[PDB]
Structures are given as C-alpha cells and as structure tokens.
C-alpha cells in the first residue's frame, strides 16, 4: 500500500489481528484509541493520547498495569467491526480483555485522560470494619456487600473482578474475617441491597468461584428496566439506536416514577428491543422540556423522542388506563403520532439528538 499525505507515526503500540488478543487479555486495564488517519478528530487526539500515556506510565510502571494502544480502523476493519466502532476516535476501556460498557467521552486533555485512568485503576470496594455500618448504608443508591472469610481467596478474586467492572453502576462493599464471620454461617456470601427500606435483601445463590455467573447476577441487579438518563450517559444511551420513551418528573416525585416503571413492566415488555425506557429529572432537563413547551410545573410528563421529533403523551393519569401506554409506542412505529400531530404541521424537533455523538466531536460512520 502506497502511503498517503496523512501517513502518521506514533510510539503507542499498534494493535493488529495477530497481537490484539494477547495484549488486551494480559492488560489489567487497557485504553485503546480506535481511529483513522483521515479523521481530523483522531489527528488532534494522537499527541494528547501519547502524552497522557507517558504521564500514566510514570505512575503505573509495572508491566500490564495500564496498557495504552491504538487501532487503525482502515487497516484493521475486522477489529473495528469486532468492537462495533461507529465513530472516530473511539476510546474503549478493557479489563483483562473484556470491553467495558462505558467509553471515555470526557475532555480530550492530558489531565482529564490521566484523571480518568487514575479513577478507573482505583480500588472501588469499601471495606467494612464494623457490621453496624450496614445499618447506616445510604439506601438512596444500589449497594452490593460481599462477606468473605479471606481476602486471599478465589471467591474474593471473582468479587474483585466484578466490582472493578461495575463500580460505575453500583457501590461495592466487603467484609472479612471476624468482622464477616457472624454473617458467614453457610460460608462466603454476596448480598444485594436494593434502594429504599421496603425492598428485602437479595442473596446470590450461584457459585462464587464462577466469574461468569457471579457477574451475570450482579449486573442483573445493577440494570433497572427504566434507566435514568443524565448528561453523563446521554451519548451512550443515544448510541443504542432506539427512540426514547421518557418520564420527566421532579426528583421528589417518586410516586409517578413508581407508577411509570410498573406500567412499563406491565405493558411494554414486548417493546424491550424496540424503544428505550427512561426517566429524567425535570429540573436538569428543562431545555428538552422546552422543545415540547413544558415546564417542571407540567410534570409528570411522558414523552417520546424519536431523534427526529418529540411527542407528548396526553395526560399522565391516562398511563393507568390499560391499553394507553402501549398504544402510544405503537402509534410511534406506525407513523400515526407524526400524522396526527396538531397544534400538515410538523411535530417539534428531537431534543435528545443533541446529546448523541456529534459531527463537531467525531467522524461519524454511516448506519
């Protein structure tokens, strides 16, 4: 192949089909830049990526502690397809060869990049010294507690792997030895504490030596049916490629959230892979709410954002009427919502398209 004017050089390790599995599998944490020579955003990233690497290597000198690599997606389309690359540059985090769900989507600076790896390499598990601390757990979030006889054990090593992968989705806590023995009657145990004080504890019954099964059970508790959309996760949620069904509500309005999650669970399971069920704090999402001429005072508001348009569910109470919510999402897919929108008039434009990966930040790849 005859080099182009955009031909580049970098000391960052280049991944290819022959070396990728071994390099990634053996890296406790790896940050991989999927890029293309002709991408202006990739071009500006490269020197930032390299300096960040040098900074981080100085703090993590040991082999396979933190590995920085890159993938030329033009030269290795199989690797790009393997990881479902849809934009350049894409920064994926791996742990022991496993790709993490969250990409690096933050500031493209040496400092923000090094901060990120520092946070990710940090131990996320908080060890309990006194079993009285379980009573004072903040039940406004998800908590997973592992009780082990010994930190130097296969059970804890599985738990450590899982916590490292899911710390951004749940709070992990540990308890060992004599602190842990009172709750260790039948051996080591893993307990999920759901948010609130009206939900009982849930106990893991699988093999704690089995990373695959233990990961699946914990990850299942970490993912609700109706996810909260935030400014942080908005890009990721748009990238799942599904239109949004959104409850906008006040943070203190727990009642309408509960009603919504129950009616979704009751009516929309068939639509699981056809629309994304979400809720959003209406004070934080006042700008999207202006797209549908609503204010926090109008909430609770149920809306659809198709990434072309936004549609309003008539009146929140109607969600209690047995067919209504399902008909709303059916009317989306049939084109009826668009057809029947009334003040020939176009419905208002999508607001959440603005949180999707932007041509002002990436080279976007065609569907």
Boundaries of every domain in the chain: 1-123, 124-224, 225-367
In contact, 353 and 238? CB cutoff 8 Å: yes
**What is the structure's resolution, reported in angstroms to one decimal?**
2.0
In contact, 28 and 96? CB cutoff 8 Å: yes
What does the alpha-carbon distance between residue 163 and residue 125 come to, in Å, rounded to a whole number? 7
Q: Cα 290 to chain center, whole Å?
A: 26
Q: Determine the topology of domain 124-224 in CATH.
A: Glutaredoxin (3.40.30)
Q: Looking at residue 316, what DSSP letter applies?
A: G
Which ranges in 83-233 belong to alpha helices (H)? Answer: 110-121, 154-166, 177-180, 211-222
What does the alpha-carbon distance between residue 3 and residue 6 come to, in Å, rounded to a whole number? 8
Backbone angles phi, psi at 317, to 5 degrees: -50, -35
What does the alpha-carbon distance between residue 194 and residue 223 come to, in Å, rounded to a whole number? 11
- Cβ of 95: how many Cβ atoms within 10 Å? 16
What does the alpha-carbon distance between residue 230 and residue 215 come to, in Å, rounded to a whole number? 25
Q: Looking at residue 235, what DSSP letter applies?
A: H
Which residue's entry shows tokens 């079993």?
131
What does the alpha-carbon distance between residue 3 and residue 289 come to, in Å, rounded to a whole number? 50
H/E element, 311: strand 310-312
Q: At what angle do helices 254-267 and 324-333 cross, to 10 degrees?
A: 70
| Burial class, 199, CB count within 10 angstroms (exposed 0-12 / middle 13-18 / buried 19+) | exposed
In contact, 316 and 301? CB cutoff 8 Å: yes
In contact, 175 and 145? CB cutoff 8 Å: yes
Identify which of 212, 201, 194 has the alpha carbon closest to the alpha carbon of residue 261.
194
What does the alpha-carbon distance between residue 303 and residue 313 come to, in Å, rounded to a whole number? 6
What does the alpha-carbon distance between residue 308 and residue 2 come to, in Å, rounded to a whole number? 42
Q: State the pairing for strand pair 126-127/13-14.
A: unpaired
Residues in the chain: 367
160-193 as b/e: b if 16+ CB within 10 A: bbbbbbbbebbbbbbbbeebbeeebeeebbbbbb
Take residue 229 and report the two structure tokens written for it: 């959309």
**SS3 for 332?**
helix
What does the alpha-carbon distance between residue 362 and residue 244 come to, in Å, rounded to a whole number? 23
What does the alpha-carbon distance between residue 26 and residue 65 come to, in Å, rounded to a whole number? 9
H/E element, 6: none
Identify which of 244, 230, 340, 339 has the alpha carbon closest to the alpha carbon of residue 301.
244
Assign 3-class secondary structure to 34-64. Answer: EECCCCHHHHHHHHHHHHHHHHHHHHCCCCC
CA distances from 233 to 170, 246, 335, 361 (A): 15, 15, 28, 16
Backbone angles phi, psi at 35, to 5 degrees: -145, 175
CA distances from 27 to 18, 32, 97, 318 (A): 16, 11, 7, 52
| Burial class, 43, CB count within 10 angstroms (exposed 0-12 / middle 13-18 / buried 19+) | middle
Nearest-5° Cα angle at 98, 95 to 104: 65
**SS3 for 198?**
coil
**SS3 for 227?**
strand
What does the alpha-carbon distance between residue 350 and residue 306 come to, in Å, rounded to a whole number? 7
**SS3 for 88?**
strand
- CATH number, span 1-123: 3.40.30.10
Take residue 177 and report the two structure tokens written for it: 């030895």
Take residue 48 and report the two structure tokens written for it: 């930032």
Method: X-ray
**Do 1-123 and 124-224 have matching folds?**
yes
């Amino acid at each position: 192949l005859v080099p182009r004017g955009s031909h580049m050089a970098s000391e960052i390790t280049s991944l290819d089909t022959e070396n990728i599995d071994e390099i990634l599998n053996n890296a406790d944490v790896a940050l991989v830049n999927f890029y293309a020579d002709w991408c202006r955003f990739s071009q500006m990233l490269h020197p930032i990526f390299e300096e960040a690497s040098d900074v981080i290597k100085e703090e993590f000198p040991n082999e396979n502690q933190v590995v920085f690599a890159r993938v030329d997606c033009d030269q290795h389309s199989d690797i790009a397809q393997r990881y479902r690359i849809s934009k350049y540059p894409t920064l994926k985090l791996f742990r022991n060869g496993m790709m993490m769900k969250r990409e690096y989507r933050g500031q493209r600076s040496v400092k923000a990049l090094a901060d990120y790896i520092r946070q990710q390499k940090s131990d996320p598990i908080q060890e309990i010294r006194d079993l009285a601390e379980i009573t004072t757990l903040d039940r406004s979030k998800r908590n997973i507690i592992g009780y082990f006889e010994q930190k130097d054990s296969d059970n804890y090593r599985v738990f450590e792997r899982v916590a490292n992968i899911l710390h951004d989705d749940c709070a992990f806590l540990s308890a060992f030895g004599d602190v842990s023995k009172p709750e260790r009657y039948s051996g080591d145990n893993i307990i999920y504490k759901p948010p609130g004080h009206s939900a009982p504890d849930m106990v893991y019954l699988g093999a704690m030596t089995n990373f695959d099964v233990t990961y699946n059970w914990i990850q299942d508790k970490c993912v609700p049916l109706v996810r909260e959309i935030t400014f942080e996760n908005g890009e990721e949620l748009t990238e799942e490629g599904l239109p949004f069904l959104i409850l906008f509500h006040m943070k203190e309005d727990t009642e309408s959230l509960e009603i919504f999650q129950n009616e979704v669970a009751r009516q929309l399971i068939s639509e699981k892979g056809t629309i994304n069920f979400l809720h959003a704090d209406c004070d934080k999402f006042r700008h999207p709410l202006l797209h549908i001429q609503k204010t926090p005072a109008d909430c609770p508001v149920i809306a659809i954002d198709s990434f072309r348009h936004m549609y309003v569910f008539g009146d929140f109470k109607d969600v209690l009427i047995p067919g209504k919510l399902k008909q709303f999402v059916f009317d989306l897919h049939s084109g009826k919502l668009h057809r029947e929108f009334h003040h020939a008039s176009s419905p208002p434009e999508s607001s959440f398209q603005k949180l999707a990966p932007s041509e002002y930040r990436y080279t976007l790849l065609r569907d």
